[PDB]
Structures are given as structure tokens and as C-alpha cells.
């Protein structure tokens with residue numbers, strides 16, 4: 111059963127929801143981000159020293 | 160006690176009802192069709208298959224001539240070719256160079272494959288309709304028997320005498336002419352026996368696969384043998400059976416409406432969901448219990464806790480109750496709004512029980528009958544999640560099933576608004592007309 115939602119982009123703050131499937135008891139869902147990493151693409155132009 | 164009703168002609172969907180016998184508690188009745196078979200009356204017209212051309216040894220008459228005679232063979236051909244000078248491994252066969260004649264003969268016969276690879280052309284007329292039913296009543300478990308859907312022949316199922324009426328529709332998927340090839344049936348208007356044309360399906364026709372009288376209509380033409388060669392060349396239109404097998408098209412098994420399944424032994428259409436079936440079942444008297452002998456149910460309150468108008472039993476409801484004797488109690492919803500999954504429940508002195516139901520209505524409102532009592536259930540239902548399901552719906556959708564309370568409010572506002580606005584004009588006209596009358600008087 112697919113559950114779709116929007117959670118805030120916060121680390122350490124868990125997102126809580128009840129997965130309500132018709133005819134079945136709700137299943138508690140908890141999604142928490144441990145870390146988020148933005149990894150850009152880099153090209154070395156030159157080295158200075 | 161005889162119970163008469165009409166159930167839909169739907170295979171796999173059970174028909175549920177309560178048998179209400181005055182003086183006795185209602186007995187729950189459930190009838191389910193196991194299969195439905197339309198068995199038309201068929202008459203084999205002829206058998207068609209690929210032809211085989213039999214060519215006897217030609218008569219090579221050296222220094223003379225011979226004459227062809229007719230023979231009782233299918234598509235028999237005989238032609239005398241004069242002026243032949245055949246050669247063989249041993250040299251020139253004949254001495255004379257011109258007064259020399261070859262008589263060629265050829266005829267059509269059934270191929271060996273015709274014993275296995277052939278099509279049967281049948282004339283189809285109306286015939287017997289049969290069905291198999293699965294029935295329960297009271298405490299008696301499932302019983303089944305094969306019955307005739309004609310409304311005259313009764314069947315004894317678990318000591319109950321069942322009469323199944325004729326189908327409300329005489330529709331049948333077979334035309335007046337069908338061609339049976341292998342496991343497939345084709346609604347093909349085959350040519351009558353003796354009128355088949357070369358290159359078409361009926362080019363070869365036989366009354367039976369073992370018949371000694373074969374009709375063959377091919378353009379079998381004897382050609383002149385090549386110079387110096389002893390052979391019987393001929394030209395013939397390619398077999399119309401092989402041509403048909405390429406062009407036979409879609410069989411009735413693939414295009415029959417209403418999901419009919421076609422079977423060949425005997426030829427029949429199965430599980431056609433067409434119309435409804437009147438029924439009459441006589442429930443044994445021993446199955447009925449007096450009112451005073453059954454538990455009395457009161458203080459009923461029905462709460463729908465979940466509901467989706469899905470094809471399955473997407474609804475769940477809780478019924479609170481109080482009853483004496485704390486016995487078993489039939490449960491049924493006579494209204495078509497919702498179909499109840501449970502047939503009966505066990506009741507205590509007081510408590511509640513739950514049941515499941517299927518409904519197409521966005522706001523279900525149905526009467527639930529509880530042995531000797533009844534309660535009204537109301538609620539709201541959510542749309543289903545699955546767009547496509549692999550099973551047929553357990554409920555019947557009505558015209559007003561989709562109308563929500565919001566839509567009903569708008570309908571009442573629109574209808575009430577226009578009606579009230581028109582009525583105002585009519586009243587205003589009548590009032591002013593009366594005022595003018597009193598102006599004169």
C-alpha cells in the first residue's frame with residue numbers, strides 16, 4: 111500500500127503518520143532523516159600553491 | 160413452504176433471501192448458480208476437409224486410340240490425349256509416331272487428414288437450457304444438483320423441491336449455422352450441401368467422415384502430358400479448407416457476448432450472464448422453528464464503522480443488541496442497497512456483533528433484518544483505491560447510488576428554486592386578478 115505525503119526537510123525531527131488502508135487497521139509510519147547531503151558536480155580547474 | 164422469487168442470471172454471485180413462514184421464524188435461504196449452460200439442438204449438415212486428388216495410371220495405347228467413359232467418382236476427369244510419343248528408361252514406349260494415345264484419369268477423394276483435421280458444419284436450433292445450483296437453508300449445509308431451466312421439471316436438493324423458471328431472455332450466441340473446427344465454434348454461413356464452390360470452404364463436402372458419397376467441386380482440369388513423358392499433369396484450385404483455415408478469423412469463443420464460454424461436448428454456451436431466472440423452492444417443514452421457540456432480539460442499533468463502495472465487501476458495521484435465550488439468529492438485508500456477507504450470527508443476552516457488506520451507494524441506507532426484528536443502518540462510503548479489479552462486483556449499482564448528499568442538496572435547491580419561483584408568479588397573477596375583480600365590485 112503506497113502512502114504519499116510531504117515531510118519537512120529537517121534532520122533529527124521524525125515525520126509521523128498513520129497509514130490508513132481501506133478495510134484494515136491503520137499502520138503507524140515514522141520516517142526520520144539521519145542526514146541530508148547536497149553533492150554538486152565539480153571540475154578541478156587548477157591547483158595553486 | 161414454497162418460496163417464489165426472481166434471481167439474476169449471474170454465475171458465482173449468490174442469491175440470498177429470508178423464507179418468512181407465518182407462525183415460524185424466518186429461515187435464511189441462499190441459492191448460488193454453479194454454472195449455466197445453453198445447449199442448442201444441433202444437426203450435422205456435412206463434414207469439410209482438405210481434398211486429395213487420386214490419379215490412376217494413365218492408359219498408353221500404342222498404334223491406336225482409346226475413349227473416355229464416365230465413372231461415379233467425385234469431380235472425375237477423363238481426357239484422351241492423341242499423338243503422344245512417350246519415352247522411358249527402356250527407350251521409346253510406342254512404335255507409331257502419331258496414331259498413339261494416352262488416356263489420363265483423375266478424381267477427388269478425402270485426404271487421410273480428414274479423419275482428424277476437418278470442420279463440422281452444424282444446423283443450430285433452440286434447445287434445452289440447464290444449470291447447476293448450490294443451495295443452503297437453515298442448518299442444512301450446501302447441496303447441489305443439475306437442474307433444467309424450464310420452469311416445469313422440479314429437482315430434489317437436500318429434501319427441498321426446487322423449480323427453476325425459464326430464462327427471461329431467449330438470447331443464444333449461436334446463429335442458425337455454425338462451423339465446429341477443433342475446439343472452436345464459428346458463426347459461418349456455410350454453403351448448403353451440393354452447392355459448394357471451388358476454392359471456398361465448401362469445395363469438399365461429405366455427409367459424414369465415413370460417408371461413401373463425397374461431393375467435390377474443384378476446377379480439376381487434366382493437362383496434356385509433356386512431350387515424351389508418361390505422367391498425368393493437372394491443374395486444380397487450391398483447397399478451400401486450407402484457405403478457410405487461414406481466413407477463418409475470430410472464433411465465437413473469442414467474440415461471444417456476455418462472457419459466454421463455448422464447449423463442444425455437447426455444443427453449448429456456458430455461464431452467459433443474460434437476464435434473470437424465476438425460481439420456486441419448497442423448504443422442508445422441519446427447517447422452521449416457531450417464533451416463541453427462537454430468541455427475541457430488541458434494542459437494536461446499527462453503526463457503520465467503515466465503508467467503501469468497492470466491488471468486494473468493503474463495508475463493515477457494528478450492531479448493538481439485546482436478546483433473550485441468547486441463541487443463533489439469521490441476518491439479512493432485504494433491500495438491494497447492500498449485500499451482507501454473513502448469513503447468521505450468535506447472539507448473547509446483550510452485546511454487539513459485526514457484519515460485512517458490499518454496496519455501490521455513496522450514502523448507504525438499508526434495513527437489516529435480524530431474526531424476528533429489524534434495524535436501519537446509515538453511513539457514508541469512500542471511493543475505492545483500485546481502478547481495476549480481477550473479480551466481479553458483489554453488488555448491483557442503481558441510478559441514485561452515485562448521488563451524494565451534496566448533489567441531492569443542489570437538486571433540491573434547483574428544483575425547489577424553479578418550482579417556488581414559478582409558483583410565485585402564478586400566485587401573484589391570481590392575487591392581482593382577484594384584486595381587479597374587487598375593484599369592479
Ligand SMILES: *[C@@H]1O[C@H](CO)[C@@H](O)[C@H](O)[C@H]1NC(C)=O
Nearest residue numbers: 191193292293294301302303
Ligand atoms: C457450494 O458452495 C460451497 C461453499 O463452501 C462449496 O464448498 C461447494 O463446493 C459448492 N458446491 C459445488 C457443487 O461446487
